[PDB]
Design a binder for this molecule. Structure first.
Ligand SMILES: O=P(O)(O)O[C@H]1[C@H](OP(=O)(O)O)[C@H](OP(=O)(O)O)[C@H](OP(=O)(O)O)[C@@H](OP(=O)(O)O)[C@H]1OP(=O)(O)O
Ligand SMILES: [Mg+2]
Ligand SMILES: [Zn+2]
Lengths: 55, 170, 261, 52, 175, 167, 278
RNA sequence: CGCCGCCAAGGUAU
């Protein structure tokens, strides 16, 4: 879900999300590599794929 | 009556449309890109063979063309209501540009789409009962004694003063 | 072919789809001037198909000849207009699939063609519409074509010039003799003949088709304009007026006697 | 198409007439020309009649 | 594809047999808990036996759920009528929908109605809690005959003979 | 609620701005209402970037409806971040992002031809989306003050009127 | 090709004020754009924003004004709905033979609803067939097959609706277009169909050919195959659109006699389907 | 050793 802080207006004008991402790089590269391997193994084990119906 | 199947599964798919296939054109294994891929592949395999005359099909004697549609996509449709009509040729009969005007030269003043849209959304003389209702020469249904007293008043009719000429009938 | 189909009549019934298919294929033919024969053949076969109980194919070819009149050849366009003329003659006008609501506005750019056969067939169909279909307009078209019917004059056949005055008369019968009248009086300063006498006859026809005393006060008034041609035009219009009315001039002799003196 | 460097025209014009209205306006313009030249030259004997 | 069904997914399905045929009503139990709860409870009590359809407005509505047949008899299993439960994705843009019949404020019981078309005047006024699986919607389109004799109540109204429960979440008891 | 209320304030009532952020006339516009209602780059480019984030948030809420898994959303918003121009029309009123589209369209091959090494499969499933994500963050990172200033000038031109012969 | 008054010695001595004298002629620039129409308007290079005009279904994949003007002269005056009404009049008149099937009581033409002919998101039925009892329909299938297993629900009525489209060189396979469209409208919830059974007929105007996808009772398929081949052979609206293309495109034949086309089986052999002789 | 991928004002007057 990624719960997140926000900074919004009283009347509901605009809701600024106020958070800088702040990720450390070796755990970042390892997470992307882990999901790379899992997603290669997921596409290898799928019979055929249909993407989104993008609207 | 339409009997049911007696199942707990709902009416359709589980994704509720998240895998629309868009199979309006020729499908995947029969499309011309797939035919070109098969032809290219079999031209890559048979190389040491020199006219083996099993002939393999039509195009194999020795991705362009009909390109495959994106299956994962609807085209974003818009209603182009705005026509290009020579108004000075439509309602008047003479365009000042002649044949150099870019528009249509149309003169059919029929309804547009939006007009269809906002049209689809929505006796008598004495004033008594007919004591023997009887006629004259000219359809005038009168009474008996009332028209006798009327002839005693004036020898003509009452509605349009027609010459009765002593002619009074039922 | 017309005499053969007129002698046949009902007996040509298992032949009309083949002949009309031959015509509908024939109507392109390289555009090497073999297209007026097919349209003239339609104009001949217009009579025999009504007497053979065939109106569905009439409705088929009416919307074909409705837009095969976008030609550049005048010799083909005249035969197309003659075929459409024969369609309007043999069929009742209010029950045709090219209705008058969108047919006469397609006839109006054809009116600006200076070929004599195109002009003849066009203004004959316009006269047929003007005396039998004057309710299919917005009342503005008969006023904007009568100015173009002034430029329709000076055509040297005498059939165009005798049909166009009848078209003026039925235009004025349709939309009243008070607006085309000023057009016919403004056609009296031309310097050219065959354009001032051919509107003199039009003044006579607007005088004689609809009732009198609608054209006579302005015709008396135009003599006050100090020009030679308008005075000669109003005098010759009085000549054709009394020539066309005859016995109805018993009340107007005392009114135009101070003009004739 | 070059919409800026084409021979243009205004909408709802109607065009220009045939020979009849053109030489009618030509004769009226020559009439006005003759009247203004006799107005400058001050000729009291030039007179127009009841028929032009 | 571009059809865009435009509705949340369903949960729970019941079968309902009338003389007009079989109707498989599938409910939105998540988007409307109390109305679907009352509906499955009254189906499990066999409460809709001998219940007739007492109002037919052809093209607009066909009403049921009245054991008396007058248009005012409605008894929930709550003791009191319950609240309105609305949803922005559940509107009256089509036919085949089921909604609790209401008379103004929060007054909903056994009295409900099937839809027969576009019902934009009923938006934000009634609680949509279910639809009908297609290939069976014509068994309730046979309910709309012009035999009404009045604004409602035709000659021979169709009655519900049985009400089966195909799927039953949030387990309940008949009292 | 702001891109429709601009139209509602400017007294148009014929441009049907929809939720998926497009724009459609309805009434076959005459000259006095065509020239009043056409927008420049500040309205339209904001409309396309809001349509882009609208498709992104629609993808995320489609995931959290509960009928599609994580790999399918990965390939989905990878296609979204890699194939703008095909489905958003954002290049139409700002051409400089077109090269960035090419900058996406190139790097996808760096992704897509490294799934296919070995017995993996030719079909879709390319769900490595961070690379197009970084460059379309780099777009808005430099374009935010630009069309911020453009929409500020738009609000000035709308609310306090124009200056005809001032500057 | 174009021969009618090309040189044009003396046109008719008009005035030729400014633009009709010196400006360029727009009609060759629009008939040439009309001539390469499916490969200037192809659907699958940019598959995004498409802009269909009023009353038509071209969808215009591109912002090309010249092609839009050249395609509206051949969809000029309500002839889309005229093709609609004409072919539904043909395939309701051809069902006057009622006893050759099991039994057909009436063939109801429903309420004539405008905007139906080009509404692509929603649809309704066009005509309806009633019965007394139990029409045994089949599984939904095409018209290019011959199996006809016929094991489905016995139903009462049977709706028939027609569809229209336009070419575009990348999607001309209406055996799949009709199937996908019938699946979309039988999974749609906006439908006001009288049955989920009846056939959806799709005909392809540019590259003109015909198909359908639905279920079939025994007196339906081989009747209406030849009956709609007769519609493709003889139809006023679907031929005046052809001669309107001819008047907007200047195509002409150069033969003295008719090019061997008749009611013979030779003539549909070359309709880009594969037919063998044995 | 493998360019290139396009919107609008310009016209149906005010
Ligand atoms: O046609 P290619 O030059 O061979 O490249 C295609 C193409 O990518 P590009 O056109 O951007 O280079 C496809 O994307 P589309 O533009 O056709 O939408 C892409 O598919 P994805 O959209 O999933 O990325 C994938 O084609 P495929 O569908 O087979 O995966 C890909 O490379 P390949 O055709 O060699 O696989
Ligand atoms: Mg200008
Ligand atoms: Zn023009």
């Amino acid at each position: 879900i990624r719960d997140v802080p926000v900074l919004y207006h009283i009347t509901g004008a605009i809701s600024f999300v106020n958070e800088i991402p702040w990720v450390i790089e070796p755990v970042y590269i390892s997470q992307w590599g882990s999901m790379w391997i899992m997603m290669r193994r997921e596409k290898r084990d799928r019979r055929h794929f249909k993407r989104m119906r993008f609207p | 009556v339409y009997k049911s199947t007696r199942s707990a599964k709902p009416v359709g798919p589980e994704d509720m449309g998240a895998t629309a296939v868009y199979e309006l054109d020729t499908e995947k294994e029969r499309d011309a890109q797939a035919i070109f891929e098969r032809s290219q592949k079999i031209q890559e395999e048979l190389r040491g063979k020199e006219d083996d005359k099993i002939y393999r099909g039509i195009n194999n004697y020795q991705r362009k063309g009909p390109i495959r549609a994106p299956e994962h996509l609807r085209a974003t449709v818009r209603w182009d209501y705005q026509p290009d009509i020579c108004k000075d040729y439509k309602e008047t009969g003479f365009c000042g540009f002649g044949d150099s005007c870019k528009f249509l030269h149309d003169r059919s003043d029929y309804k547009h789409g939006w007009q269809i849209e906002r049209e689809l959304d929505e006796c008598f003389i004495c004033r008594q009962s007919f004591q023997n209702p009887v006629v004259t020469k000219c359809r005038h249904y009168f009474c008996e004694s009332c028209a006798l007293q009327h002839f005693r008043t004036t020898p003509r009719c009452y509605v349009c003063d027609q010459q009765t000429n002593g002619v009074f009938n039922p | 072919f017309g005499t053969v189909v007129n002698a046949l009549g009902k007996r040509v019934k298992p032949y009309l789809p083949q002949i009309c298919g031959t015509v509908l294929w024939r109507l392109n033919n390289k555009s090497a001037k073999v297209r007026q024969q097919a349209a003239d053949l339609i104009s001949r076969t217009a009579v025999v198909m009504k007497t053979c109980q065939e109106e569905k194919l009439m409705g088929h070819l009416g919307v074909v000849l409705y837009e095969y009149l976008g030609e550049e050849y005048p010799e083909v366009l005249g035969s197309i207009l003659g075929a459409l003329k024969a369609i309007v003659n043999v069929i009742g006008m209010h029950k045709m699939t090219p209705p008058i609501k969108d047919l006469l506005p397609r006839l109006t750019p054809i009116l600006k063609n200076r070929h004599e056969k195109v002009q003849e067939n066009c203004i004959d169909l316009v006269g047929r519409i003007a005396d039998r279909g004057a309710e299919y307009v917005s009342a503005r078209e008969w006023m904007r074509i009568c100015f173009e019917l002034l430029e329709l004059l000076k055509a040297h056949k005498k059939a165009i010039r005798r049909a166009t005055v009848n078209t003026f008369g039925y235009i004025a019968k349709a939309i009243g003799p008070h607006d085309v009248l000023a057009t016919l009086l403004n056609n009296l300063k031309v310097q050219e003949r065959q354009n001032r006498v051919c509107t003199t006859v039009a003044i006579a026809i607007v005088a004689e088709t609809c009732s009198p005393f609608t054209v006579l006060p302005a015709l008396m008034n135009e003599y006050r304009v100090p020009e030679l041609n308008v005075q000669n035009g109003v005098l010759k219009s009085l000549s054709f007026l009394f020539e066309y009315i005859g016995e109805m001039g018993k009340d107007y002799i005392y009114a135009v006697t101070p003009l004739l003196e | 198409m070059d919409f800026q460097h084409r021979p243009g025209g205004k909408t709802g014009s109607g065009g220009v007439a045939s020979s009849s209205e053109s030489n009618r306006d030509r004769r009226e313009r020559l009439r006005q020309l003759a009247l203004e030249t006799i107005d400058i030259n001050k000729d009291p004997y030039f007179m127009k009649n009841h028929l032009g | 594809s571009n059809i865009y069904i435009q509705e949340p997914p369903t949960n729970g399905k019941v079968l309902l047999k009338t003389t007009a045929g079989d109707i498989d009503i599938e409910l939105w139990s998540k988007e409307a808990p109390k109305a679907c709860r009352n509906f499955i409870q009254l189906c499990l009590e066999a409460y809709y036996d001998n219940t007739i359809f007492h109002r037919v407005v052809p093209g607009f509505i066909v009403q049921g759920g009245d054991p008396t047949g007058t248009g005012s008899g409605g008894e929930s299993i709550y003791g009191a009528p319950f609240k309105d439960e609305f949803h922005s994705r559940l509107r009256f843009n089509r036919r085949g929908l089921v909604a609790m019949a209401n008379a103004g404020s929060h007054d909903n019981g056994s009295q409900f109605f099937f839809t027969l078309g576009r019902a934009d005047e009923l938006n934000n006024k009634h609680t949509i809690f279910g639809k009908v699986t297609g290939d069976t919607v014509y068994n309730m389109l046979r309910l709309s005959e012009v035999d009404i004799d009045d604004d409602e109540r035709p000659h021979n109204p169709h009655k519900i003979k049985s009400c089966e429960v195909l799927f039953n979440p949030f387990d309940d008891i008949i009292p | 609620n702001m891109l429709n209320l601009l139209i509602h304030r400017k007294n148009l009532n014929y441009l049907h701005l929809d939720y998926n952020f497009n724009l459609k006339p309805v009434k076959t516009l005459t000259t006095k209402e065509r020239k009043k209602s056409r927008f420049g780059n500040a309205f339209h480019l904001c409309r396309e970037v809001l349509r882009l984030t609208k498709l992104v948030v629609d993808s995320h809420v489609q995931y959290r409806l509960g009928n599609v898994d994580a790999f399918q959303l990965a390939d989905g918003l990878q296609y979204i971040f890699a194939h703008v121009g095909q489905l958003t029309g954002m290049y139409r009123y700002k051409y400089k992002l077109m090269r960035q589209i090419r900058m996406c369209k190139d790097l996808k091959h760096l992704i897509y031809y490294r799934f296919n090494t070995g017995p993996v499969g030719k079909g879709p499933g390319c769900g490595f989306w961070a690379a197009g994500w970084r460059v379309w963050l780099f777009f808005m990172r430099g374009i935010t003050p630009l069309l911020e200033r453009w929409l500020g000038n738009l609000l000035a031109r709308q609310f306090e009127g124009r200056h005809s012969k001032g500057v | 090709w174009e021969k009618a008054s090309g040189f044009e010695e003396s046109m008719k001595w008009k005035k030729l004020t400014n633009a009709q004298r010196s400006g360029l002629n727009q009609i060759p620039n629009r008939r040439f754009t009309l001539w390469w129409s499916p490969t200037i308007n192809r659907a699958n290079v940019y598959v995004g924003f498409q802009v269909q005009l009023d009353l038509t279904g071209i969808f215009m994949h591109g912002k090309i004004p010249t092609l839009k003007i050249s395609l509206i002269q051949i969809f000029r005056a309500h002839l889309w709905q005229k093709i609609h009404e004409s072919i539904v009049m043909d395939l309701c008149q051809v069902f006057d033979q009622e006893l050759d099937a099991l039994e057909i009581e009436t063939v109801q033409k429903e309420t004539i609803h405008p905007r139906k002919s080009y509404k692509m998101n929603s649809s309704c039925a066009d005509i309806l067939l009633f019965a007394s009892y139990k029409w045994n329909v089949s599984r939904p299938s095409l018209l290019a097959d011959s199996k006809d297993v016929m094991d489905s629900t016995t139903t009462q009525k049977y709706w028939i609706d027609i569809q229209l489209r336009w070419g575009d060189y990348d999607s001309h396979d209406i055996e799949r277009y009709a199937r996908a469209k019938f699946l979309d409208y039988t999974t749609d919830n906006m439908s006001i169909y009288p049955s989920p059974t009846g056939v959806l007929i799709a005909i392809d105007l540019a590259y003109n050919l015909h198909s359908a996808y639905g279920n079939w009772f025994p007196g339906s398929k081989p009747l209406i195959q030849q009956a709609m081949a007769k519609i493709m052979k003889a139809n006023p609206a679907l031929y005046v659109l052809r001669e309107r293309i001819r008047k907007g495109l200047q195509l002409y034949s150069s033969e003295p006699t008719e090019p061997y086309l008749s009611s013979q089986n030779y003539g549909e052999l070359f309709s880009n389907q594969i037919i063998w002789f044995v």
